[PDB]
Amino acid sequence: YGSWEIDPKDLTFLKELGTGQFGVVKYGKWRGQYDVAIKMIKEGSMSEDEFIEEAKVMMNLSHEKLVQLYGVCTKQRPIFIITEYMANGCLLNYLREMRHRFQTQQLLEMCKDVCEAMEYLESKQFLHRDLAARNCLVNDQGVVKVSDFGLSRYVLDGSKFPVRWSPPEVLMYSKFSSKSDIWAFGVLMWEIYSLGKMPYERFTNSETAEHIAQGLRLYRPHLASEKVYTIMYSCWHEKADERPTFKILLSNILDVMDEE
Numbered sequence: 699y700g701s702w703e704i705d706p707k708d709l710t711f712l713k714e715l716g717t718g719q720f721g722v723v724k725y726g727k728w729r730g731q732y733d734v735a736i737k738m739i740k741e742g743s744m745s746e747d748e749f750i751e752e753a754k755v756m757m758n759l760s761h762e763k764l765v766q767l768y769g770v771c772t773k774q775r776p777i778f779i780i781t782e783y784m785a786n787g788c789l790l791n792y793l794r795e796m797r798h799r800f801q802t803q804q805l806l807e808m809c810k811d812v813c814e815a816m817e818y819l820e821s822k823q824f825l826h827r828d829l830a831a832r833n834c835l836v837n838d839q840g841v842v843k844v845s846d847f848g849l850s851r852y853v854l855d856g857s858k859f860p861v862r863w864s865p866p867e868v869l870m871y872s873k874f875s876s877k878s879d880i881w882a883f884g885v886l887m888w889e890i891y892s893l894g895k896m897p898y899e900r901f902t903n904s905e906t907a908e909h910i911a912q913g914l915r916l917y918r919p920h921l922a923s924e925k926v927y928t929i930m931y932s933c934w935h936e937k938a939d940e941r942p943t944f945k946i947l948l949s950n951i952l953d954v955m956d957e958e
């Protein structure tokens with residue numbers, strides 16, 4: 699077993715958490731004690747050899763606000779991805795549960811959680827490439843963490859492309875960069891302050907792409923202060939080089955935290 703490789707005999711499977719296009723995710727214990735999520739990858743869905751090689755680099759990405767990769771099980775099929783367990787599940791579903799009755803201070807803390815993770819990835823020159831609330835998870839303490847960073851590079855399956863999280867230069871020319879992650883982060887802040895509404899909810903993807911290329915934008919969620927709106931809107935400059943960095947976004951968010 700290599701350092702990126704977990705012995706599947708060390709896993710105890712306890713509950714199913716969800717089933718989707720990338721496979722089935724289960725809750726279990728590692729060596730009888732440690733909570734893990736076990737992702738069993740659907741056969742034929744991923745470029746598995748490429749994914750395994752990249753898993754070695756993913757092992758070295760570690761930040762309190764990134765969902766932790768513990769290792770992979772690749773000797774058998776389906777391959778397993780072993781990750782940090784996040785008891786409260788997907789951020790998008792969490793936002794849509796109105797019983798939480800969130801205060802805006804809690805919403806800003808979720809944005810800061812994500813921005814800290816994203817600042818760390820930026821410092822490692824690592825792109826998420828599909829940042830959205832559906833790819834964030836929530837633990838039992840209510841902390842939001844960023845998941846599936848870089849995963850889309852290995853998905854073999856466009857009618858399912860994240861149009862609504864993409865800047866004009868991605869939609870027009872497939873120009874991915876740090877600044878396309880910045881754009882997506884702004885949409886993610888909009889999702890959080892909108893309690894999980896679909897961005898451009900009344901539009902199709904094709905209509906959204908035309909809207910955005912014409913220079914039109916999402917507008918202020920009811921729960922976002924003017925200062926919070928300024929931060930998310932700064933992510934959507936037509937010119938990619940005029941968008942901030944995640945370091946600057948984090949500073950701006952911390953400043954608003956103090957003021958509010």
Ligand SMILES: O=C(N[C@@H]1CCCN(c2ncnc3[nH]ccc23)C1)[C@H](Nc1cc(F)cc(Cl)c1)C1CC1
Pocket residue numbers: 715716717718720721722723735737738739765779781782783784785786787788832833834835845846849
């Ligand atoms: O993980 C995913 N979906 C689960 C559904 C059940 C609820 N989840 C969790 N609940 C508790 N702890 C948890 N840790 C980790 C996840 C998790 C999220 C998705 N990614 C994905 C990637 C793959 F390569 C193979 C598969 Cl099958 C899925 C996507 C990020 C949302």
